[PDB]
Amino acid sequence: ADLELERAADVKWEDQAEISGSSPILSITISEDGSMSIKNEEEEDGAYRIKQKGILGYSQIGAGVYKEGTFHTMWHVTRGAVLMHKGKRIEPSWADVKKDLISYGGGWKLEGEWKEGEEVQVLALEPGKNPRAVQTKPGLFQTNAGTIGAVSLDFSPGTSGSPIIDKKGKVVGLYGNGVVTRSGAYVSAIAQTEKS
């Protein structure tokens, strides 16, 4: 399929979300003169949206993180497809379908490791919404897969792959799929594997 990357935000902790719970991530484009704010309301390191080309235009299907020569996203988002940035092809290099992970241009570079009790920020890239840092306390949960980290934030469908950041600005994982845990909690998994 026709899959495009659109850079949305820096991978950094947002102080305002600590104070407030939430904070928009506003980026300024310098233009050929005027400053303006990026407004996704309207339709290389960083967070990106993954858009499919429709007849009606581009629709966001997920999100991911560029770091250390490598794009990182969810298997179920791209399902192994080649991605496009500005006419360049980026081809998948590594996947773990059971972890729901896929990297492009290299092996897994993400190195954050969430510690139980500590707060994190989801740098959420909801379709048609500006980025928002959302500060949250994830939990340890039990699943038929085993033990997962997970957060009790339910974003809109195509936010999956948004990075989850500790206070050092490390990516502790990606905003994964909805699961009902042992216990009956409906939660989103922190999708992560080890740096290779």
Swiss-Prot record:
Domain named Peptidase S7: residues: 44-196
Region (Interacts with and activates NS3 protease): 5-43
Residue intervals on the Cytoplasmic side: 1-43
Residues at the catalytic site: 76, 100, 160
Record's comment describing the protein's domains: The transmembrane domains of the small envelope protein M and envelope protein E contain an endoplasmic reticulum retention signal.
Annotated family: In the N-terminal section; belongs to the class I-like SAM-binding methyltransferase superfamily. mRNA cap 0-1 NS5-type methyltransferase family.
Protein name: Genome polyprotein
Species in which this protein is naturally found: Dengue virus type 2 (isolate Thailand/0168/1979)
